[PDB]
Amino acid sequence: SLNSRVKEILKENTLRSMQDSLHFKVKEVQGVLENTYTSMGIVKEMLPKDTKREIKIHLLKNFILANSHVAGVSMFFKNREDLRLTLLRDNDTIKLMENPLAQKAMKNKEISKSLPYYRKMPNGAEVYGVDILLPLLNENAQEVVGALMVFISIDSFSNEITKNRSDLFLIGVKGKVLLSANKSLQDKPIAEIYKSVPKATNEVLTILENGSKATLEYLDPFSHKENFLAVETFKMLGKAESKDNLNWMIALIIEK
């Protein structure tokens, strides 16, 4: 008898310890984004200052070199044709000459972000990432003079999500898998992938809209064994306010 009272107490503790482990991982991903956004704020303020084009390229280059999860940055200046540049990682950085999200951002004077997409890199590879768009202001902090685009590599979060583990999912807009040990799931919705357990995907998709966190059980269509699932949301753009600031999600699974 008391065996069975012990087994329900231990299951409670398994679920809560799983939730703590997920929370630790969420904070780790938020802290990567926050390191990047701190540097990005400083570049945003310094890029429109009264500096030669070459200073500005040094600034963008050192921003990317310092931020491992940034795969490229772009500046566009309204009234300067020599300040419309992209930098992308290759071995070090490659400079290349030459906009709805950016047009929006300059007009609302507000940080924007794109949906996840693949972008080609100097060595023919394709990096899955999101653009973050920021207005650049003149000295008086009122006139918009340009835009800064930061390409955040979602693949870079392999250091946090898939490194020596395969039990973690990074989930994004509308249930899309952004990153997971199984690269075949990238860019596909959990509603498609996990159609065999509709209560689960729909409980998960609720938590993703509502923010919040939760645990459940579901039958994994790949392993065919029963799995504990724990999910937890955070705001990808952090504090901000922008209409574009959505919940991302990290999911953690454990075989029952």
Next chain:
Amino acid sequence: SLNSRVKEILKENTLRSMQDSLHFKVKEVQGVLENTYTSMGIVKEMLPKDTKREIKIHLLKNFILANSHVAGVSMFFKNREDLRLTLLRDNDTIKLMENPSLAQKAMKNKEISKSLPYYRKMPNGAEVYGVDILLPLLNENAQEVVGALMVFISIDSFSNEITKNRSDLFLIGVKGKVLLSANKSLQDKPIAEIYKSVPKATNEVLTILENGSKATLEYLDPFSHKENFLAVETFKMLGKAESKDNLNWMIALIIEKDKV
């Protein structure tokens, strides 16, 4: 027999659990520090570029405004006496001064250096406990040192992570110096002396500090006169950066033994 076996089992789970809680706190503190180390790396690279004095000050102002645990930032140029400036937090604003800004050794070293903890006089008359991180500024060819950037990290500002809404955590530094705890009068004192009534405990902690490990133990608290569990964990204060001046800091977590 079932009761004792289960009680030992629960006790290990409890130590293990407070190590998890402490590791979380260590990564939060290291996250805060990484905000600053990433951006001071950019500042380090941009400062000696060919820009006007007024651009260099804007960059320093932006750097300190964006890093809440930075309480002062300074630039020194070997050959430009107009670029010898300090920005200090003055209550809620920033205060520019041109004072006479170890910094020798930093410029001779070409690696990132660090001071020992000290009490810095602030413009509002208060003293802030922190450390200077010193970064050399290199010319174009990355080979010759033209000056230094110094970043004063306020240890006191980690109260948000260590002592806000709790009193069970300690930040510990060089040779067991207490850097931050809820009992303000421990600051800057060695645990060897604070906890002299438990010499086996301090010997163990001090050993973990030098070996860069983690552990748990039990000790009788000289202040509450109750027995405590104690978990400790070291981390490299400068994080990923190689440096002669790097060392282990530590966070410690205590819990009254008769509450778990």
